[PDB]
Amino acid sequence: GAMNSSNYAELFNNDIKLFVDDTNVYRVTVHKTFEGNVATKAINGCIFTLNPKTGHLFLKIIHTSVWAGQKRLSQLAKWKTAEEVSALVRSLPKEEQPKQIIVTRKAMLDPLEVHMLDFPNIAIRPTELRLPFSAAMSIDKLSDVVMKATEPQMVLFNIYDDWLDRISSYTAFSRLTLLLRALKTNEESAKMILLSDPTITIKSYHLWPSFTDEQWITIESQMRDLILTEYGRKYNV
Amino acid sequence: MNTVPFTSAPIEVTIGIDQYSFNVKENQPFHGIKDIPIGHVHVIHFQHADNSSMRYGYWFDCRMGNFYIQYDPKDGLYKMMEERDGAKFENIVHNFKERQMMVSYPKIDEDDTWYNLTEFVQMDKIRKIVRKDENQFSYVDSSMTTVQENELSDPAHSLNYTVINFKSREAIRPGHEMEDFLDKSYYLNTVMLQGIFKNSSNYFGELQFAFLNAMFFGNYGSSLQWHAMIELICSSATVPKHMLDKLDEILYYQIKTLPEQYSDILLNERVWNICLYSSFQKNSLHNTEKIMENKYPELL
Ligand SMILES: Cc1cn[nH]c(=O)c1
Numbered sequence: 001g002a003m004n005s006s007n008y009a010e011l012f013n014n015d016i017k018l019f020v021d022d023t024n025v026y027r028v029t030v031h032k033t034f035e036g037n038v039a040t041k042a043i044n045g046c047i048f049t050l051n052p053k054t055g056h057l058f059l060k061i062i063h064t065s066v067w068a069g070q071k072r073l074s075q076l077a078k079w080k081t082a083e084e085v086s087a088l089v090r091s092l093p094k095e096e097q098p099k100q101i102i103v104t105r106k107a108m109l110d111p112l113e114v115h116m117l118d119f120p121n122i123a124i125r126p127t128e129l130r131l132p133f134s135a136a137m138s139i140d141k142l143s144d145v146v147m148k149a150t151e152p153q154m155v156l157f158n159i160y161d162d163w164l165d166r167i168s169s170y171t172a173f174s175r176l177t178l179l180l181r182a183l184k185t186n187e188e189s190a191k192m193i194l195l196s197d198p199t200i201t202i203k204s205y206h207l208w209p210s211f212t213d214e215q216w217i218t219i220e221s222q223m224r225d226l227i228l229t230e231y232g233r234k235y236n237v
Numbered sequence: 238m239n240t241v242p243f244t245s246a247p248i249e250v251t252i253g254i255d256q257y258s259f260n261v262k263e264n265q266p267f268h269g270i271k272d273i274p275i276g277h278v279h280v281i282h283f284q285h286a287d288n289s290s291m292r293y294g295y296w297f298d299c300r301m302g303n304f305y306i307q308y309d310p311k312d313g314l315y316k317m318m319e320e321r322d323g324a325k326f327e328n329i330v331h332n333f334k335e336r337q338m339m340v341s342y343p344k345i346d347e348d349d350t351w352y353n354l355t356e357f358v359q360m361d362k363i364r365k366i367v368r369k370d371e372n373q374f375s376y377v378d379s380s381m382t383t384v385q386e387n388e389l390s391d392p393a394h395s396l397n398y399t400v401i402n403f404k405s406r407e408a409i410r411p412g413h414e415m416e417d418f419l420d421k422s423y424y425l426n427t428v429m430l431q432g433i434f435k436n437s438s439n440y441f442g443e444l445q446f447a448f449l450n451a452m453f454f455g456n457y458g459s460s461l462q463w464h465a466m467i468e469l470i471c472s473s474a475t476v477p478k479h480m481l482d483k484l485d486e487i488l489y490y491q492i493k494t495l496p497e498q499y500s501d502i503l504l505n506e507r508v509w510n511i512c513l514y515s516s517f518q519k520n521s522l523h524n525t526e527k528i529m530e531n532k533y534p535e536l537l
Contacts, residue, residue, distance in 0.1 A: 079415035110404070114414045117406050 003102050003127035011052045012169040017100040018058075020085055021048040021133035022108055024146075025062050026077035042067050046146045047081050048136045049088065051098075053169045055160030060084050061146055061153040082111035088154075089119065098122060104131050132180035138187050141207050161206040166213065175220065179208070182223040185230045193222045239299030240330045240339070241281055242269035243315075244307035249286035250315065253294065253453060255279055255351050256494060257343055260286075268338035269306065269330075273299060277355050278363065281306070282453050283315050292454045293378035298360040301373045305329075317374050353490040354449065357442035366397050366446065377450050383458035396458060398447060399433055401465040403472075420517070422475040429469070437480050440466065441487060448491050451503055464508045471516035481521045488525040492532065500533050510537055 003010070011017070025047055028040040045062035066080060067073050089097050100123045101116075103109060113124050137143045145155050163172045182190040200209045211219055231237070241254075249263040254270050261267045263286075273279060282294025295317040297304050302319045303326040309316050320326040333339055344351070360373075367375035383396045402408060408424045409417045417423050434440040444466040450459035470476055470484055495503060513519060513526050514537070530537065 076415070083414070110418070111415070113404055114409055114418050117404070117409060118411075 001125070003125055003129060005129070009170070011173065014053075015099045016051070016096065017053070017102065018085075018098045019048075019050045019052060019102050019104060019131070019133070020081065020108060020112070021050075021104040021131070021136070022078060022081040023105065023134040024048065024137055025081050026067070026073050042073070044146050044149050045077075046136070046142070047084055048133050049085060050133070050159060052173050055158045055164065055169075055172065057157040057159045058088055059142060059145070059155045059157060060088070061149045061155065063149055063152050066152065078108055078111045079115075081108060082115040085112060086115040086119075089116070089122070100125055102127050104129075104133055132177060132184045135180040135184035135187075138180075138183035138190070139207055157207065159207060161203075161208050161210075175216070178220060178223050178227075182226050185227055189226050190223065193219060193226065238272045238342075239275060240269060240271045240273065240334075241297070241299075241317075242305045242326075242330050242333055242339070243267060244305065247308045247310070251284045251286065253280070253282035253284075254342060256354075259340060266338055267340075268333040268336075269340075270342055271330075271334060271339040272341045272344075274342065274344060274351070275299060277351060278358050278360055279351075280449065280453060281317070291379055293376065294453065295374045295376055296360070296363050296367070297374035301360060304374055317372075317376070319373060350490065350494060353486070354445060354494060356445065356487070357438045358445050358449075359442055362439060362442050363446060366443070368393070368395075368397060377454055377456065379454045379456055381456060381458070383462060386458045386461075396450070396456070396462075398459075398462045399429070399443060401429075401462070401469055403469075420472070420474045421469055422473040425469050425473040426475065437477070437483070441483065445487060445491075452491075452495060452499070455502075460503060460505075464505045467512060468508050468516075471512035471518045471522075474517040476518065476521075481518060485522045485524045488522065489528055492525060492528050497532070500536065504533065504536055506536050513537065 025045045027043050027045045029043065030038060030040055033039050042064045044064055047058075047060040047062065049058040049060065050056070062077075062080065062084075067076070070076050085101065089101075097119075099121075101112065102125045103112060104127060106126045109124060109126055116122055116124060137146065142157070145153075159176060160172045163175065167175075179190070179194075182193070194209060200211060200215065202209050246261045246265050246267040247263070249261065251258055251260050252267075252270075254273075270281070278296055278298050280294050280296050282292060284292050293314065295304075297317065303323060304317050304319055305326070306315050306317055308314070320329075360375075363375050364370070364373075367377060369375065377396070381394055381396050382390075383398050385398065385400045385402070387395060388400075403418070403421065403424075407428060408421070410423060413423070430437060430440060434443070444463060447459045447462040447466065450456045451463055467484075467488070470480065509529065513522060513529065
């Protein structure tokens, strides 16, 4: 059924699975028209499809031309997401196809289920976890490739950099979700933390800085303090 | 005017005939039902006084043969049987008519209710949903499951309604996933009407039969089927005008006949609210929406 805190370790077992997050597929800026009405202008988006065990990210860039002349775009965006996820699955060798696909938003269940009718043995699951994958566009290299795209495109990343050489998937996922939650709750402070020391760089082939084990403990602590602080700055505690 | 004679009534039972019902006491001199209107299917149904579990009954058409009911004390139920000796049947019924041992089908002359509930129901279609080819009449009860229920377990005892599943390859053309899910017109008009049912009259007959089994036997899978057949039409943007107008009439009389007290278990809130207030056809069911709002405003 649904994925929650009770069945959390299932993410890191040896059954291939993918998270799908559609929160950055349809993106707009709202602005005033010359006549004083309101209008939207779409910007490029992306599907965030992630294997939590391996870190493999399948970043499908959604170019604004896919909305041209379409109506009910927020509805269409869910079906476009499911069409692209289904196309991705079909493009993978059988032994690489997922056994489960977990959507971060329940409105993706029916569109994905319908697009995956041909795959009756792939389970489509929701989750009770509040995952912070909307903040994917706060990662500079992901934001950059999305905003520069001039046509539909798929780009492949490892969102864990080389962490699995030193830590387990469980710990790597915990680090990723702490970082993203921080970027989501206070992007400015989060990014200040991650870069403050210029001697630590981001490798050309990485997304995050090259911290040592000890420096990641410091960073992780600073992200917790940030999240707790905002929680207080918000509710006043 | 035809007759369903009874051998006797050895156990106390509530007997239904179509939308009417009457109580018979244990060993009461009851010998059947006369004056049954020719030209419609009918249903004769039973609820034992000592065990309200298992409503059951028989769908029949008197044009197809001479049928009588005899209690079987081994299997413990009133059974329909066909009499092949037409002289015996005439003599038996006449004997009983002269002794005034039969109740009269109590139809009010102005009252078109049964016609309106069975307008498109034919015995030949009933006997393909209820498979027992050695009999001209069809047994149904509270507990029989549908072919679709059994897929999600005795096949010989199933209700073979047409399977409708909105998230199935039958319902969804490859490459038209969003279009076909959000507008079921393809599935209604091409797959079901042209493909399976051949015409809207057979579709409506099955819909009406499913409603009657839901109402008279509390058969849960029949209620599922009735609601699925309504929802498939309401969720289609392109439906022939004559079908929409007929559906409104069909549903109006189903809602009108439903016991006011069974609406909590026989009506599906989501289906009805979707059909009357959100679907493509929200503005096409004027009579049904008016009776529903005045009779069952709580559901909505
Ligand atoms: C009541 C009835 C009618 N016909 N044949 C029978 O044996 C019995």
